[PDB]
Amino acid sequence: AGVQCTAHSWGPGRAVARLPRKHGGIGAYANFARGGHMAHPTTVIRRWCRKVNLNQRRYAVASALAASANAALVEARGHRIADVPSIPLVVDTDNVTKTKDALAIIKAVGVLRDVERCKDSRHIRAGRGKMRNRRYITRKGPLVIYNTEDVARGFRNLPGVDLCHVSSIRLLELAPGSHPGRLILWTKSAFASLDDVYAAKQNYTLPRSCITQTDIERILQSDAVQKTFVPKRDPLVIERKVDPFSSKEALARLDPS
Amino acid sequence: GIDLKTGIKKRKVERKEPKSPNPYIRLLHNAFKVVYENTGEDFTKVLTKRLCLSKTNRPVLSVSRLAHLMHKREDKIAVVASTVTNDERLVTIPRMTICALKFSATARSRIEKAGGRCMSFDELLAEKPTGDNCVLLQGRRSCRAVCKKFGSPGRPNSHVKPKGEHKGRRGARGRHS
Amino acid sequence: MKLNSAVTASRRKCRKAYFTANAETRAKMMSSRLSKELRAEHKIKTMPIRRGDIVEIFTGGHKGTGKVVEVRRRDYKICVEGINQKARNPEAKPVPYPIHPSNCIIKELYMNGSRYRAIKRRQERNAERLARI
Amino acid sequence: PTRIRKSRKRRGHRQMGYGRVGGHRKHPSGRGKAGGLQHKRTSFDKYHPGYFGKLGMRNYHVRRNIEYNPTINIDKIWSLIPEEQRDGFLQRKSTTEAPVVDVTRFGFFKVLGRGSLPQCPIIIKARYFSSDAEKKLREVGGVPLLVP
Amino acid sequence: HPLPHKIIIKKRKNKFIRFQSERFVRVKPSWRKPRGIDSPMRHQYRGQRPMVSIGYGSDKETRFMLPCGFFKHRISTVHELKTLFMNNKTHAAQIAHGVSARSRKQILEEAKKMGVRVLNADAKL
Amino acid sequence: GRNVAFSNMRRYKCTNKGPNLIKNWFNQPARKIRRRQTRLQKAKAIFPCPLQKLRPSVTRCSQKFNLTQRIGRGFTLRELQGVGLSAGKARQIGIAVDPRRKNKSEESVARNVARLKEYLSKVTIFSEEIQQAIQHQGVVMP
RNA sequence: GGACGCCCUGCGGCCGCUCAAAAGACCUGAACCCGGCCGGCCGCCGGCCCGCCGGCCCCGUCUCGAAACACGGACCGAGGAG
RNA sequence: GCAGAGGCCCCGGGGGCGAAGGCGGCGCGCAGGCCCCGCCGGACCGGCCUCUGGUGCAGAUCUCGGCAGCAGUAGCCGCUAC
């Protein structure tokens, strides 16, 4: 691109800038010239894919799974979970092959307001994305995890729903837009098999548990920590400058006599 | 105009707070800041800085080093703000109580098999906030490889090793090469 | 979601096909909902529009019933009798308003003999599908 | 990435961190490590001792696997014994049933003696030994052995 | 009506205009720091135009406060206006330019219910 | 510059002209699929037979790897004699045969003759039961 | 894709018409520049009702030093370089 | 501040009851800038968190397009002529 033409600098004495010019005298072969090359042409040698350590990929998938268990983190991510009876939500499904039957489970389990928020959020995107095979955006909502159940067909056409096997959970799904807290509907096979999947990681040991702010705040107000505290000396008194001779009280405060 | 440049030496920079994304290290530092402010004790001031130190300035302390560094003070509790690793070379670990930011899986299993206790700064903050019966220990900062090539290899008093392969004689054979 | 890699979801390729479709494809792209009465008799939901079919427009603009006398395949529109733009002067040749086949319901079909065969083929295939494969 | 980079913060500053008096010009000091015994002598002598010249004899083809010598220290020979086996071995001590460690099967050819062996007899079999390793292993009551 | 407040002292009344904006249309009036090797503006010689500095910064008590005495929160939906209602006596509402005259009537009625001032109430009318 | 290790990177050659000396790996996730399909197609072509032939256990070369054994190319004629199979017969029963390889050690013949015996028990030469046979996947005897 | 009527030697003009809209050879319709009408004596910064008073050299740039009788720059718009 | 990507925007963000753009006017910010209002315009557009870059112009005898003042100016003088 931009280099397919034959252009040479006209020279140094023709009252023209020294940029390369075509036979007619037309600017060519430069970033500032119309039809010229990019100064630094973009190239496929860019590293498109980064690298992550398996222990670090598996830390995130586990931490995202844990974030799903919090019904405050789940509500912060946007998902509507008020009707949901309990988080984590496990549902004894069988083989659900009908969207009509899946909706009845989504309603009874209590995620309907969330699967409706997504349905009623389809819209044409802002930008040239609309022209680039990215025209419609729908809010993400529930994610069904399945093991040994045919729940794919019924829950797939439902909108804003995503489906994952317990054998290959996907971080991008667990934390949509780098936000942990996805409302996940779990089949009773998947939730029972989650401890088997973690065991099958050959030598993985789950990140050891750590405490939260609430535990630290409780410790700082604990009998031992509070008792050790010493009360500091009383603060210094400052007071803005006053000329003593202006006020007898100011003089009295400086020299009482 | 005032002259506050003819005796003033410029201001230095420290790591007042941690640069770690890890939310746990930040929560421990905020808590120890509270204890130091609430009781102005050296153990809490030293530990608040150690948690704000960088990974390079916080070196690993193995259970072999910890045992030697605690031979006389066995009753006391160690408090490294760093990972405690294992020396497979010491084949009989003694019993000791160690508070560390992280313990290797082998160090935790060696210590508790031996009969000790692997604490954590949250347990330290409740049990011993001002570090009573606690010795804070540190690993050797100079141990790193990067730290051994710091200097000018090439000067007569360098005592430093050249960075790359070199494979040559002019300057390496002696003081007159 | 489409699971056939060979079908294209590209706006450009889909719109290139629509505006460059062969006349056989263009004709089936120009189909209208058969009327509830005609649907029951022929047991098929939509038929491609043809000259001499009587259609009723449900769309609010230029809405009426009439016979298609002209199919403008190139602009994918049909001309219904009665659907005409206001003339500048009373004594002038009527100009038809072009209506999209989609905007109308087919009240009556020009039956012919090929259409009788075509509506039968479609209903035989629809029988195999309705027999749950 | 590019947004967080410093170069983006230098827009509106003309030379962009390269100086008005002398700016960014192509290759001002030369291309590569060129000028080391001349204009850049101070750098090659200050930080790069030994860069210029030929040292010892040359092997036209090095046999990397014939010149390969993995080494183990007397300190790390009980690491090779697994934990469950190691604690009982130490307690029993014993001469008739004392652990035979063949460092070759763990991939080590010569035994050096950096640290201290635990005080219990152990037989160590290797391709070669160092005197201090042999003396520390013989003090513990152990026997150095050669392996086929 | 807002809470009473302290007189809003604007240190400068006029906008900071780039140097030589008057001579050229290529130079638009936006502030660009003067960085010329021989710049009268950067040297701050007598008769040059002001230079943007943190000194002209307003009291942090009244910064961002509209002449009415309230701070401005842009509202684009009736749910968003319910945060302005959530215990706000120091804030006022600006409906966006996008909201239609059909939607403004609903937002004005909700604001009327919760006693929130709307800055552009007379819009689209 | 200052204290740095001199780079041992060779300068890029033929960058804008000549042979394409840059390779790109965007075909990597597709290549896995193409070769998996090829192995599935070859496996379908011979359902009872395994994809790979029995190959010998050989000591990895050099002292660095002497105490470790790896799959080799073919069983020697001397090893085949131990199981009493001809070169042509062994090839028919999916056993790779290497005429060039010479045994080297008595211990090598013994390990390899044992291999063939374990395979001969496993092999089920067939001259609809074929459909119920289970095709072996991967290296035969690993 | 421009009804009618009026005017004109004709061209064309006017009145409108078709349309949601002329959108009229074409969507939007910026700046530079220009014409009609209306206001003003006119550069920038400050104080005042506002035309006075006071201040103010042409930027960019290499340069010890540029308002330089150093060099580039009529104007505008888009493109234009870690 | 720009242009995209992944999310959010309490019944599922704002839009022919008027999107972007354009023109004029307030307000807000030390400032880059932002916001609203009126008018034109006629289908799209964001705020925030995360991510990404061909990401900001007064200059380069800059490129390409428009185009001014000079200026109704220089000129419209071979070949005898109507």
Would you say C109 and C115 are in contact if contact means Cβ atoms under 8 Å apart? yes
Max CA distance (Å), chain C: 60
Q: Which residue has the tokens 């240190």?
A: E11
> What's the CA gap between B166 and D47, in Å, rounded?
11
- Which of B89, B111, B173 has the highest number of chain D CBs within 10 A, making it the mutation to test binding with D? B89
Pairing status of strand A162-165 against strand A143-146? parallel
Please, which residues have CB within 8 angstroms of residue E27's CB and are 6 or more apart in sequence?
E18, E20, E21
User: Helix/strand/coil (H, E, C) string of chain F?
Assistant: CCCCCCCCCCCCCCCCCCCCCCCCCCCHHHHHHHHHHHHHHHHHHCCCCCCCCECCEEECCCHHHCCCEEECCCECHHHHHHCCCCHHHHHHCCECECCCCCCCCHHHHHHHHHHHHHHHHHCCCCCCCCCCCCCCCCCCCC
Data resolution in angstroms: 3.4
Residues 119-138 of chain A in contact with strand H via CB under 7 angstroms: 120-121, 123-130, 132, 134, 137
Sheet holding C104-108, edge to edge: C46-48, C31-34, C104-108, C54-57, C65-72, C77-80
Query: CA-based Rg of chain F, rounded to a whole angstrom?
Result: 23
Q: Smallest Cα–Cα separation from A1: which of A31, A26, A28, A38?
A: A38
> What's the CA gap between D71 and D112, in Å, rounded?
7
Provide the positions of strand G that have an atom within 7 A of a protein CB. 1-4, 17-19, 31-32, 43-47, 55-63, 65-67, 75-77, 79-82
Distance of CA B103 to the CA centre of its chain: 14
In which element (H, E) is residue B134 found? strand B134-135
D 4-63 residues inside an 8 A Cβ radius of F: 33, 43, 47-48, 51
> What's the CA gap between A213 and A38, in Å, rounded?
52
| Protein residue at shortest CA distance from C1' of H64 | A34
Q: Which two tokens stand for residue C119?
A: 């509506």
Amino acid at F20: N
Half-sphere exposure of E86 (CA within 13 A, CB side): 7
Would you say B154 and D47 are in contact if contact means Cβ atoms under 8 Å apart? yes
> What's the CA gap between A102 and E69, in Å, rounded?
54
DSSP symbol at B84: E
Q: Which residue has the tokens 């035969």?
A: F140
Whether residue D99 is preceded by a cis peptide bond, meaning omega within 30 degrees of 0, is no
Q: Which residue has the tokens 């943190």?
A: E54
Contact D66/F63, CB-based, under 8 Å? yes
Amino acid at C50: R
Query: CA-based Rg of chain B, rounded to a whole angstrom?
Result: 22
CA distances, A60 to each of A205, B41, B117, E41 (Å)? 14, 38, 29, 54
> What's the CA gap between A182 and B58, in Å, rounded?
37
> What's the CA gap between E120 and E95, in Å, rounded?
7
Which parts of A13-128 fold into alpha helices (H)?
Answer: 54-68, 73-76, 99-109, 112-119
Does strand H come within 7 Å of the CB of E51?
no
Contact A219/B31, CB-based, under 8 Å? yes
List, in sequence order, every residue forming a beta bridge with D125; answer none if it has no partner.
Answer: D102, D145
Pairing status of strand B117-119 against strand B97-103? parallel
Residue A236 is labelled as binding a ligand? no
Q: Is B158 on the interface with A (CB under 8 A)?
A: no
Does strand H come within 7 Å of the CB of A27?
yes
Does strand H come within 7 Å of the CB of A24?
no
User: Helix/strand/coil (H, E, C) string of D88-107?
Assistant: HHHHHCCCCCCCEEEHHHHC
> What's the CA gap between E11 and B151, in Å, rounded?
54
How many beta-carbon pairs below 8 A join chains B and D? 65
Sheet holding D123-126, edge to edge: D100-102, D123-126, D143-146
CA distances, F136 to each of B73, B78, F49 (Å)? 63, 57, 7
Q: Which residues of D touch E35 (CB under 8 A)?
A: 12-14
Amino acid at A155: F
Query: CA-based Rg of chain E, rounded to a whole angstrom?
Result: 21
- Do D and E touch, 3+ Cβ pairs within 8 Å? The answer is yes
Pairing status of strand C31-34 against strand C46-48? antiparallel
Å from E58 to nearest chain D CA? 27
Contact A216/B127, CB-based, under 8 Å? no
> What's the CA gap between E119 and E94, in Å, rounded?
5
- Do E and C touch, 3+ Cβ pairs within 8 Å? The answer is no
> What's the CA gap between C36 and C105, in Å, rounded?
9
> What's the CA gap between B6 and A246, in Å, rounded?
38
Residues 161-220 of chain A in contact with strand H via CB under 7 angstroms: 172, 176-179
Q: Which residue has the tokens 């001779």?
A: A245
Would you say D78 and B91 are in contact if contact means Cβ atoms under 8 Å apart? yes
Contact D12/E35, CB-based, under 8 Å? yes
Q: Smallest Cα–Cα separation from C56: which of C108, C116, C104, C95?
A: C104
Amino acid at A199: A
In which element (H, E) is residue C31 found? strand C31-34
Amino acid at A80: R
B 28-57 residues inside an 8 A Cβ radius of A: 28, 30-31, 34-35, 38-40
Which parts of chain D fold into alpha helices (H)?
Answer: 41-46, 77-80, 83-92, 131-139
How many beta-carbon pairs below 8 A join chains B and F? 8
CA distances, C11 to each of A123, A129, C7, C23 (Å)? 16, 11, 12, 21
